[PDB]
Design a protein around this ligand. Sequence first.
Ligand code: VO4
Ligand code: VO4
Lengths: 555, 556
Amino acid sequence: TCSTSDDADDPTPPNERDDEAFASRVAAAKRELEGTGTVCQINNGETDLAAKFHKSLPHDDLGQVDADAFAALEDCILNGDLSICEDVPVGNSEGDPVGRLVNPTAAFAIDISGPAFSATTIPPVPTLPSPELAAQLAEVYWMALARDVPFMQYGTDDITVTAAANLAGMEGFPNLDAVSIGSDGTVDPLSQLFRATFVGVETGPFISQLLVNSFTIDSITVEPKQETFAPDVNYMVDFDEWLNIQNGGPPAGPELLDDELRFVRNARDLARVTFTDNINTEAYRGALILLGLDAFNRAGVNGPFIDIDRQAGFVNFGISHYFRLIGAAELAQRSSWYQKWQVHRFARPEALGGTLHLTIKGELNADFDLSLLENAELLKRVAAINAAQNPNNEVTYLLPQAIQEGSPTHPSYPSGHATQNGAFATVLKALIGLDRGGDCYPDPVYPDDDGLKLIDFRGSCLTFEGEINKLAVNVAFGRQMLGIHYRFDGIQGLLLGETITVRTLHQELMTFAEESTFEFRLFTGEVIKLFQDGTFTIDGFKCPGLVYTGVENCV
Amino acid sequence: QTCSTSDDADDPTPPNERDDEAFASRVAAAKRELEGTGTVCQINNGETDLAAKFHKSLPHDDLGQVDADAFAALEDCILNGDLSICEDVPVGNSEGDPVGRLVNPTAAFAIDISGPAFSATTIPPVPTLPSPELAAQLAEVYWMALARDVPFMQYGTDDITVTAAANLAGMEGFPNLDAVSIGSDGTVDPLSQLFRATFVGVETGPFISQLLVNSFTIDSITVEPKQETFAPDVNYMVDFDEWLNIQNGGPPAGPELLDDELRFVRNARDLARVTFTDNINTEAYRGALILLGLDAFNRAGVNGPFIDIDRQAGFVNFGISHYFRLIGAAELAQRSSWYQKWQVHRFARPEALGGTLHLTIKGELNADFDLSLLENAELLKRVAAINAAQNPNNEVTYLLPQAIQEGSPTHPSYPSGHATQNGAFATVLKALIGLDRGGDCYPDPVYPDDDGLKLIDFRGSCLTFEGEINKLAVNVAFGRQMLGIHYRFDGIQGLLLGETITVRTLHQELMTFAEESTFEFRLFTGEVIKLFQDGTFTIDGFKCPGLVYTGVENCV
Ligand code: VO4
Ligand code: VO4
């Protein structure tokens, strides 16, 4: 049995390989220790249970949570114990899986890699009475009303031309997260409504090139015409059906589907993608397309290999590296879960929709800002679309859901889809690099209004990095378009995802033998550059912390 | 805001101790890896002949023998984890084609914070060039090339595969091949054993996994797996000059000829084509979506510890996030595969031993291949004839016909990186699905017809999910062998390396989870592993003595 020598072409002796791996890992962990320090989780401080998540617990007939049950939920959230979590009351005893709490104890796991779950933060949510919460909630209502308008008709359809005038008139609107908006405060329906200022999202067609172009997987070429939802029908707008879903009961039935396969061409379609995706499916498709277009090089001439001739990357700076992180970067979901349950615990849009509807009916008196509560233009359209749908044409102002089950049984903020899509977009941009990130997407297209044919897009350069960012914001805002998240869930989850992913990316980069760096553009536009000694820059400026904690701290 | 002992998080640990607690847990995890690893000795087969070593893309003489100083430059490149030193390795062809680049030789030297470090695991020494095991390993690769265009359901009648099976069973070292599928009577049944392995389920039912031939749905897009495949009969690198050009790092002679009709995978050439055009985990990702849709893994999160309780579902842990996260993350096993390829065994590819074989048969070289191969009359006459029909002026060569013009990637043979990653992904799918559901039968199994244009319903065996998951991994490993670029030891040892490594990572993560939970599933060779949060583990119910898992043979 060997000790100081063996057959490997390795400078370290066998009996030191174990110590060197330990030393390296202790140092890495020490760097997270020191770079982290004391991190303070802060929520908006409101105590109203109406603004908190409690879907699936027992509610009275006004959708108001049972006190004892909510206190058992707080018990469950705090203790990271399965058994205590099984003690939380359920509001419907039929045992349907949509009634189960979605893994409330998940956050309490220290992963050995990346930033620990409590090492990052996201901002407090706007309180229920605020002008910002009002405009955020109205925007989810207008998305629901605009679901069947084709994206290319946004500038001429009554619903979206109105949505843009009505939202721009709300006091809180200019304060919405990365809101697309003119300098004069107006909203252009075709290029700004339901958009964000992250790089490339406002340029060109609403839907990312990565969602409408063909992809090849194992020599199988796939055109992305999907099975989509039927137009014009929404769910949970009948009061008893809505209450039953808040109490944890089964959906009223399946969703109506369209008989014709179509490319994604309106918000209902985009929402459909996000209802039937599985973690990184959209980003995986984008990854394959980018590889096929040579934004990422399949033969491995990426990273430090672009400047040399003898070697190609694979495990590092090649497809092994890329597809590994496309899955591994989903680890940011653990931090997303801590934020959802242990910290913010914010009410989903359908729950606030119930509070609103009852307040409008005079059965509750929630303090919503008058910009929503007196928003006649929006509330009359909601009343009308619901009455058209409901038995006996009964009017409700509930938020129309594109799915019978409504939201998943976990808190609104942030969106897990937005956190994981921010992480996947960051992995793609970092491996493709800044230079290739700025090249223009070749032969860009947009689906026709029926989603049956692709039309050649003739306009500004759509950069690879912008189309990757667009893909991520499409997925985030597609959940909003189902009725189950607000813009703050999507924007702040995307940033949470980018920050955590820069931390893991930098951690791994420091271990690699070959000399190399990472360089790429963040969602807000700054260029980050990561170095193997632990240093990093934002637009050329060397940052002061030991580890990346967001652009705001690099000053 | 600042804070110290209290903030708005419902977390028992004060903010100012959360950094400390994460460092403590990480040190304890790294320490468990330190103490469970100890001294690990990397042992290769010890042969010194350069003909038995990888040196594709370096300068060679006209007999394909490596320039000696270039090879010592490559060893220095392998040893030092230095990009600049690796840029000094000589190249045998100046055209600058990307197929000539060395594939990331410094990759192994990176200590990943999670999982087993790159040098903490081993794979067995490769059979030496003169051994009967090597001879039968290489003959199998050649028979796979000769059987490329035979539809799997015609294996029992086609003279090529009927003879392959008998020829291989009569080779002295054949019975000692890695998990070789063979009767107790010593014969190989063409339909159910030829080019198969004894890993659970692989020998049951059709050759191709159900996960590769059934439709998958992605984002509401339903996909029928009819692929663009290679044309029949044509093989490449069978003309000596073309072969030599490829060994010196020159560009491929041309593109591969493709079939005009899209088809399901129905022969070895088609399975090879999958593996030529896949991307790390595309085959398992397709299988993962198929399994999820069949409820072998529950999309709503009723998996792992949630199966026995009513109030909660899994997601980050024991739900789809866990599942898709690990399907990509488990590719981390590729760092260890890279160490074994370059730093430890550095074994020559089948096309390289094929050039040595060819030249030895012609009397231009004198390699000591065992006589079971050098005097295999049945194999030699068929190789000569297929190559004479392919070559322009009908010149005979004994080179191993490749299914692709560029031949192997530019990195050593052992183990197969495709096999190591598919052993890891197979291991992730089984662990998350769990032992009980792993035993459920595939619901609607099929097999493609001989033209690969229609799916025929299969009957007469329960194809378990764990068995079809194992089959897919062995199909991907063996499809590289069907390209002409890997041996069976590359594939089976690669699959087992990927499994051990993944068990180590799965266990490490399991120990962190707040909820009480375990992992329990069946390994490739059939034993049931069960992993516990206190760091202990069992093999068929027997408590293992090591700190950490190091393979079935050490749990005794
Ligand atoms: O998955 V959301 O967290 O986007 O409901
Ligand atoms: O990728 V192989 O290592 O299977 O050539």
